[PDB]
């Protein structure tokens, strides 16, 4: 069972092809499972103070990878914790901040397999000495009026399971189309279809229903699980519920269509 994400109501006549369009781009799945769980945390600084100054990509780090400092000069100057992914801390350290280092830094984490990303901005204003060095909040970020000529630390720590390597059951995208018929309860609804990112497909009901009740052929290649119900019978009414699950990422989406069928007179 999947928690409520989208609920909808549909109405159609018997003998017509219904389309209960369930889709989730986050259910898109990569055929390559070679350490697909790669995480890249990188720091991007834009020096808005120096007019229109090209932003500098100071440092990259990859879970199961090195902390490559982009420019040879910044080596040593830019530092990120080596256990960053292990503990979730992705803060930066500038060993000796100077006027050249001033600007809005931005840490960005990217998860390839889930095709997910996050990021937060932190400003670094360089003041000559300690008489004007402090920290404050501008409204969307933390700003550090840093001590020129001394180490300054720009904080960001993402305390979430998505950015940690603890075992996650290596789950993959799965989908369950059920149909709570009139008088039936949800989560007991007779299963209509079952799909997995590996292409596993299961159909339910009489073969004619399976022919009429069918999900697209390349569901997970598109993140689509639209359910076609050809030549609707009035018994094909009820609450159709598509439960989309990806336990490795935490996806627990529910997409529901209350398809009530009608007949002529």
């Amino acid at each position: 069972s999947s928690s409520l994400v989208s609920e909808s109501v549909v109405s159609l006549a018997a003998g017509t092809q219904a389309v209960l369009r369930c889709q989730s781009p986050r259910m898109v799945w990569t055929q390559d499972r070679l350490n697909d769980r790669q995480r890249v945390v990188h720091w991007d600084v834009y020096s808005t103070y120096y007019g229109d100054n090209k932003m500098e990509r100071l440092c990259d780090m990859y879970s199961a990878g090195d902390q490559r400092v982009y420019s040879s000069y910044n080596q040593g100057r830019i530092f990120m914790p080596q256990n960053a992914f292990t503990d979730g801390n992705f803060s930066l350290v500038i060993k000796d901040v100077a006027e050249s280092d001033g600007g809005i830094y931005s840490c960005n984490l990217h998860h390839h397999y889930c095709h997910l990303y996050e990021t937060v901005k932190i400003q670094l204003d360089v003041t000559k000495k300690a008489k004007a060095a402090k920290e404050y909040w501008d409204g969307e970020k933390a700003v550090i009026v840093a001590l020129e000529g001394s180490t300054v630390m720009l904080p960001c720590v993402n305390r979430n399971q998505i950015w940690t390597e603890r075992h996650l059951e290596e789950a993959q995208q799965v989908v369950h189309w059920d149909r709570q018929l009139p008088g039936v309860s949800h989560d007991r609804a007779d299963r209509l279809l079952d799909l997995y990112a590996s292409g596993e497909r299961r159909a339910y009901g009489p073969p004619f229903l399976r022919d009429r009740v069918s999900v697209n052929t390349n569901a997970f290649a598109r993140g689509d699980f639209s359910l076609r119900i050809d030549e609707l019978e009035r018994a094909d009414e009820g609450i159709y519920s598509c439960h989309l699950h990806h336990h490795y990422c935490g996806l627990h989406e529910r997409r529901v269509f209350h398809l009530q069928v009608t007949e002529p007179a």
Partner: protein, 49 residues
């Protein structure tokens, strides 16, 4: 053989502007005051320098 890119000049009417560096190869910049651009339609700005 190369080719010089000559992008349209950034004109500010009755205001002030400053140069900004870029990452393009051989990037060169320069500002000029007192400009008074004209076109087939006529003046594109209206203030005396």
């Amino acid at each position: 053989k190369f080719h010089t890119v000559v992008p349209s000049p950034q004109v500010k009417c009755c205001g002030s502007l400053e140069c900004k560096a870029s990452s393009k190869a051989d990037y060169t910049c320069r500002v000029f005051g007192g400009v008074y651009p004209f076109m087939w339609g006529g003046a594109q700005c209206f203030c005396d320098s």
